A paper describes a structure:
Our work utilizes biotin–streptavidin (Sav) technology to develop artificial metalloproteins (ArMs) that mimic the active sites of natural copper metalloenzymes. Our group develops artificial metalloproteins (ArMs) using biotin–streptavidin (Sav) technology to mimic natural metalloenzyme active sites to characterize otherwise elusive intermediates and study the effects of the secondary coordination sphere on metal ion(s) reactivity. This approach leverages the strong binding affinity between biotinylated metal complexes and the Sav host to confine synthetic metal cofactors within a protein scaffold. By engineering ArMs with aromatic residues within their secondary coordination spheres, we systematically investigate the influence of these residues on Cu reactivity and oxidant activation. Our results demonstrate how the inclusion of aromatic residues within the secondary coordination sphere influences the structure and reactivity of copper ArMs.
Based on the structures determined by XRD and the MS results, we sought to test whether the incorporation of a tyrosine residue at another location would lead to increase levels of non-specific protein oxidation and whether the oxidation of tyrosines in the secondary coordination sphere was influenced by their location relative to the Cu cofactor. We therefore incorporated our [CuII-biot-et-dpa] cofactor into a new variant in which K121 was substituted for a tyrosine, producing [CuII-biot-et-dpa⊂2XM-S112A-K121Y-Sav], where Y121 sits 6.7 Å from the copper center as determined by XRD. We note that despite being nearly equidistant to the Cu center as in 1, the interplay between tyrosine incorporation and N49 coordination is not observed in 3. This difference is likely because Y121 in 3 is unable to achieve the steric influence exerted by the positioning of Y112 in 1. However, comparison of the structures of 1 and 3 reveals differences in their primary coordination spheres, in which the amide residue at N49 no longer coordinates the Cu center in 3. Upon reacting with peroxide, whole-protein HR-ESI-Q-TOF MS of 3 showed oxidation levels that fell between those observed for 1 and 2. While peaks corresponding to singly and doubly oxidized species increased in relative abundance compared to those same features in 2, the base peak at 16 443.2 m/z still corresponds to the unoxidized protein, indicating that it remained the dominant species in solution. The surprising result that 3, with a tyrosine at 121, shows less modification of DF31 than 2 suggests that oxidation depends on the orientation and position of the Cu cofactor. We point out that while the oxidation of DF31 is limited in 3, the non-specific oxidation of other residues in 3 is enhanced relative to that in 2, an observation that is not yet completely understood.
Author numbering:
A (entry chain A), B (entry chain A), C (entry chain A), D (entry chain A): 12 to 134
The structure:
């Protein structure tokens, strides 16, 4: 189904680069490079996608996580993207995301940022 | 650090069961069984955690994804949990989550549910 | 400041119509007409905005609520939009929103949808 | 219905104080005092609630907004709470919230915090 459609390099509206392989078993593996924030170079990502989506024209549900630690920096935080892949001539992955920081209990009420990223095969 | 603290069986307030192994490399692997919704038995999960958290008393950031397809059912959806592990005698994983369904474009505006789950080692 | 910039008719990407008056005291009052969902005609809205925003080029924070009851229908739900107004030749109100339904306790875990709407003065 | 049940003083898990009047017309008016963050004393709030909820045991949908400007401080931000009132001997208002700051366009990707507050009549 969308193994081929999902696998590859994607770019979001911030200029970040999402490099992913979709496995036959529903796995997502690859790397993420954020153009913004406390981040440099690539970070490991892993996630899952619906490997047998509906055939009624609906998108394909998926999600993935990055923990913001690599050999260069550690931002003590993790983002999860939850979204759907929409195939076609202008393929897209439309997501919403939650970025949680490790905090003290006193600061936990502001631990989590929320936003939305749209990924395309171009740009 | 928290490899040992995170690895194991966790339970949330809904009675769902989160079985996870935290790898030395920052990986999270395991299974999720939801007590609610269009779900039965176990589903694969994968995620990431900060394997070198701060030492100032802050929690450990992490996240993981489940795509709601297994050998029994397919709910054409995926949940990502984004949160932090808080160690101690009453250890907890405090999360917020995004559940995205595969939808048509016309229905995409209501594709995504949001909520919050707290996981404990007991119950 | 942005009393004049905010007051007026706005339209989002779904074709919904947001008619608002920004008061000198920080109040937002007006009506909302959703182009989608269990909704017809106008609904009352009320909200608040920062009536003395920063002068460093930042946007103006604001939010508002609609309860989805009017003389025609009652969808037993409420949406809150939380966002910022960005002035200029292409003025925008960029929001994220939470739509909560009245549910039984058993169904409360899926009470809340999340999304994002961008409002413009045109379309 | 819940005009009487909602009107009054509520407290959340952070120790914040939510003072609200529910009008016959679906209006919510009152003040909010946050125990945390860049806030002191009371701030105006306004919102809406379903004034004719379902009779099947479901909660009552509601939401409200605070812009974090008063005579003492201005945090250039606004929170919206979206939730439901659940009546009974242990009445509760269960919410999720979005706190948006006024930001530059470059920083807009981290403009919005998300969390969840539970309000009770005691504490
Ligand atoms: O910056 C990071 C890691 C990189 C995140 C990039 C995001 S992921 C979603 C979005 N999509 C992208 O492609 N890129 C971005 N984590 C901390 C975020 N902090 C704010 C922030 C924003 C800008 C600069 C520094 N900090 C929060 C914080 C909470 C406590 C202490 C410290 N910080
Ligand atoms: O139910 C599932 C899979 C299981 C999710 C369990 C969640 S994960 C977060 C939370 N924490 C847990 O431990 N369990 C729950 N996905 C569809 C959710 N749908 C609603 C829903 C709720 C209850 C029953 C059926 N559907 C939405 C929908 C959107 C379009 C079409 C159809 N459905
Ligand atoms: O549809 C409404 C009211 C109108 C909402 C329009 C939103 S507000 C955010 C976004 N921006 C807009 O301009 N329009 C939309 N409330 C129920 C939403 N339900 C789903 C839904 C989606 C489509 C059709 C019917 N239902 C959920 C539900 C949970 C339990 C029982 C029943 N329903
Ligand atoms: O603090 C406020 C106003 C009060 C919010 C209290 C919230 S409302 C939800 C929750 N429930 C409550 O009862 N109280 C809290 N706004 C800025 C939040 N900022 C973080 C923050 C957290 C702690 C201390 C200072 N700042 C973000 C920021 C983004 C850019 C620049 C500056 N700041
Ligand atoms: Cu930061
Ligand atoms: Cu199917
Ligand atoms: Cu469902
Ligand atoms: Cu450090
Ligand atoms: Cu509905
Ligand atoms: Cu200022
Ligand atoms: Cu702040
Ligand atoms: Cu009804």
């Amino acid at each position: 189904r969308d193994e081929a459609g999902i696998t590859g390099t994607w770019y979001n509206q911030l200029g970040s680069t999402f490099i992913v392989t979709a496995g036959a078993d529903g796995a997502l593996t690859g790397t993420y490079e954020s153009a913004v924030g406390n981040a440099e170079s690539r970070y490991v990502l892993t996630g899952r996608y619906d490997s047998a989506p509906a055939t009624d024209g609906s998108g394909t549900a998926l999600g993935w996580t990055v923990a913001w630690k690599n050999n260069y920096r550690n931002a003590h935080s993790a983002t999860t993207w939850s979204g759907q892949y929409v195939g076609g001539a202008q393929a897209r992955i439309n997501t919403q995301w939650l970025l949680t920081a490790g905090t003290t209990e006193a600061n936990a009420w502001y631990s989590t940022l929320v936003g939305h990223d749209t990924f395309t095969k171009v740009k």
